[PDB]
């Protein structure tokens, strides 16, 4: 999952962005979920640094 695609997924689901893990980027294959790192739940979303305040991890499927 490219960093471009993670960022693209971020912008699409930004309104649903939360500390609870996102649904997954894809239904088939390997994707990504994302969430706001809990220490950053109070920050306005345009002030969440991608590197520090957003958690990702793979979402492995077939």
């Amino acid at each position: 999952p490219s960093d471009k695609h993670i960022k693209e997924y971020l912008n699409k689901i930004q309104n649903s962005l939360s500390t609870e893990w996102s649904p997954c980027s894809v239904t088939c294959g390997n994707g990504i979920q994302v969430r706001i790192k809990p220490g950053s739940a109070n920050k306005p979303k345009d002030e969440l640094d991608y590197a520090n305040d957003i958690e990702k991890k793979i979402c492995k499927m077939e």
Epitope: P44, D46, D49, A51
Partner: antibody, heavy 123, light 107 residues
């Protein structure tokens, strides 16, 4: 969506100026804002960035230490304090809206822009 | 500082396809945006995130970004497309604009 600049005018090298920008047509408190300038007949040059609650500020090397970006989200306004002005700061200064997520997260374009306000710095 | 390079001028006959280049050391790794600016007017967004068009922009615009080159393509160039086209990217907490390509439409 409208972004109306003002405060532009003529001034001499060493002087100071305060540009304003009143935003309407969207939720000001969820978008980062920018200043971009354009010398007459030349290209676009970004100037400064301000996040929605003013906790993240960036300046171009060409302006760092002389210009200061600020905003008053209750007055839906974006300011730029310009000090120690130089001739080459002569440009049209556009107030243009940034992304609703941080540029490091892909929201790294500028849209829309304002008609601009002219600043001429001349001896 | 990161430099985005562009050809200063391009000339195209109506109905022909125009290609505007934009170089960068590894521009493929960055999202590119494209702006259109007509004389006496504010710039306008025509491409965000390499190829997405802000709906409001005709389908004859389309853009790519791979390796060290992003490319705005205007197929069937109309007269109203005559303007200056700027590429743009994000680097080191900076917005970076290319020198701009003044596309002339020989109408």
């Amino acid at each position: 969506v409208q972004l109306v600049e003002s405060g532009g005018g003529l001034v001499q090298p060493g002087g100071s100026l305060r540009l304003s920008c009143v935003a309407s047509g969207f939720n000001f408190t969820t978008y980062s804002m920018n200043w971009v300038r354009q010398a007459p007949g030349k290209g676009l040059e970004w100037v400064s960035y301000i996040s929605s609650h003013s906790n993240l500020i960036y300046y171009a090397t060409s302006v760092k230490g002389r210009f200061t970006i600020s905003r008053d989200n209750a007055k839906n306004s974006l300011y730029l304090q310009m000090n120690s002005l130089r001739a080459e700061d002569t440009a049209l200064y556009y107030c243009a809206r940034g992304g609703s997520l941080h540029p490091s997260a892909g929201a790294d374009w500028i849209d829309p822009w304002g008609q601009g306000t002219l600043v001429t710095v001349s001896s | 500082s990161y430099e985005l390079t562009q050809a200063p001028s391009v000339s195209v006959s109506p109905g022909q396809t125009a290609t505007i280049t934009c170089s960068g050391d590894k521009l493929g790794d960055k999202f590119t945006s494209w702006y259109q600016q007509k004389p006496g007017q504010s710039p306008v967004l025509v491409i965000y995130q390499d190829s997405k068009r802000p709906s409001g922009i005709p389908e004859r615009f389309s853009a790519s970004n791979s390796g060290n080159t992003a490319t705005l393509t205007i197929s069937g160039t109309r007269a109203m497309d005559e303007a200056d086209y700027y590429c743009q990217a994000w680097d080191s907490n900076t917005y970076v604009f290319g020198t701009g390509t003044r596309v002339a439409v020989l109408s």
